């Protein structure tokens, strides 16, 4: 399948904590990905012969900023792609990827943002997860904070990752308290909050926008992992999550036959459907990614080995693993990203290197 066709290193020599292809590319435009590390975001274009063409960076005004994460969306009126970034300052920046201008920013967490994700159906709904133990849902069309997911029954330590399900009806989050929590956003209260957020225009009213305080997850478990839970993804109604214990677990809330939409807040069972083990990934903040179709899953480890699982099989435990190594790639890989058409897989590393793998 994949062959290593190129690599480079960014000039700052700090970790690249994240990478994301733009899956909102226009037909006929080249494939583009963003990296985040140090206090910058950088865009590169993929071309033939393994060329990774350097484009342009956004560099934060603050030399002490450290960007951790990025996520792509598009402007809902204009269709132009937008890039959100955030990190240790707890500030969300919305970046024009063409000019690399910061169109606008959001403050609130004040504390480190560990992940950003956009709703799979609504390009304006942005989820941020924080070192302050809360998640927040923003509407980046009307610049409103829709809701904060927190409270003593929410996470009790840094939230490290979160993922919306297929239709963006609910979010699974996870973090340093070892737990995974479900937050439904299709409730009456939440659907209304979102609609009211679209109705909010501060020039046409006197009121501040009111945020929902959501203090109770719709399900919680600490039975999956026994350390920091640092990456979570939906797989239909099942979950894939990992800690720093060299495993990705495929599980679901409740018993084997339980419908995800009939699970109650007090559900105390989970069901384990499989576990994909690998080696040398005991450090935390190491994310896997999946291709657009969720046919496959890629994870790098702390010494520069890639694992790829073919999930195109009848049950999760039947996943087929391939590994991808290069003799010059020995630094920790923090995250992978597939292009939308699945032909390229990029890994970024703690020594600021970028690795290109083509199918």
């Amino acid at each position: 399948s994949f062959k290593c066709v190129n690599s480079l290193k960014e000039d700052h020599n700090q970790p690249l904590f994240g990478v994301q292809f733009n899956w909102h590319s226009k037909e006929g435009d080249p494939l583009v990905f963003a990296t985040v590390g140090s206090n910058r975001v950088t865009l590169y274009e993929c071309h033939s012969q393994g060329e990774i063409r350097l484009l342009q960076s956004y560099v934060d005004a603050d030399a002490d900023e450290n960007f951790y994460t990025c996520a792509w969306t598009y402007d809902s009126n204009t269709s132009h792609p937008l890039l959100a970034v955030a990190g240790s300052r707890g500030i969300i920046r919305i970046i024009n990827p063409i000019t690399m201008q910061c169109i606008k920013h959001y403050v609130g967490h004040g504390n480190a943002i560990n992940e950003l994700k956009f709703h799979p159906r609504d390009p304006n709904l942005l989820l941020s997860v924080s070192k302050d133990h809360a998640l927040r849902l923003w509407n980046i069309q009307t610049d409103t904070l829709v809701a904060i997911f927190g409270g003593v029954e929410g996470h009790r330590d840094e939230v490290l990752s979160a993922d919306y399900d297929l239709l963006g009806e609910k979010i699974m989050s996870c973090g340093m308290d070892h737990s995974l929590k479900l937050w439904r956003i299709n409730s009456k209260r939440m659907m209304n909050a979102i609609k009211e957020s679209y109705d909010y225009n501060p020039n046409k009213t006197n009121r501040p926008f009111i945020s929902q305080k959501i203090h109770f997850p719709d399900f919680s478990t600490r039975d999956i992992h026994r350390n920091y839970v640092d990456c979570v993804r939906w797989l239909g109604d099942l979950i894939l999550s990992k800690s720093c214990e060299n495993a990705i677990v495929c599980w679901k809330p409740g018993k084997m036959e339980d419908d995800i939409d009939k699970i109650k807040p007090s559900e105390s069972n989970v069901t384990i459907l499989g576990r994909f083990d690998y080696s040398q990934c005991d450090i935390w903040y190491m994310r896997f990614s999946m291709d657009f179709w969720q046919k496959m899953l890629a994870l790098g480890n702390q010494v520069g080995k890639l694992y790829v699982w073919d999930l195109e099989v009848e049950d999760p435990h039947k996943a087929k693993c391939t590994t991808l190594t290069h003799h010059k790639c020995g630094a920790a890989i923090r995250q992978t990203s597939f292009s939308r058409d699945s032909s390229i897989l990029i890994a970024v590393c703690d020594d600021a290197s970028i690795w290109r793998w083509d199918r």
């Binding site: 450090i283 935390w284 903040y285």
Partner: peptide
Amino acid sequence: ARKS
């Protein structure tokens, strides 16, 4: 658990 260390970050690096």
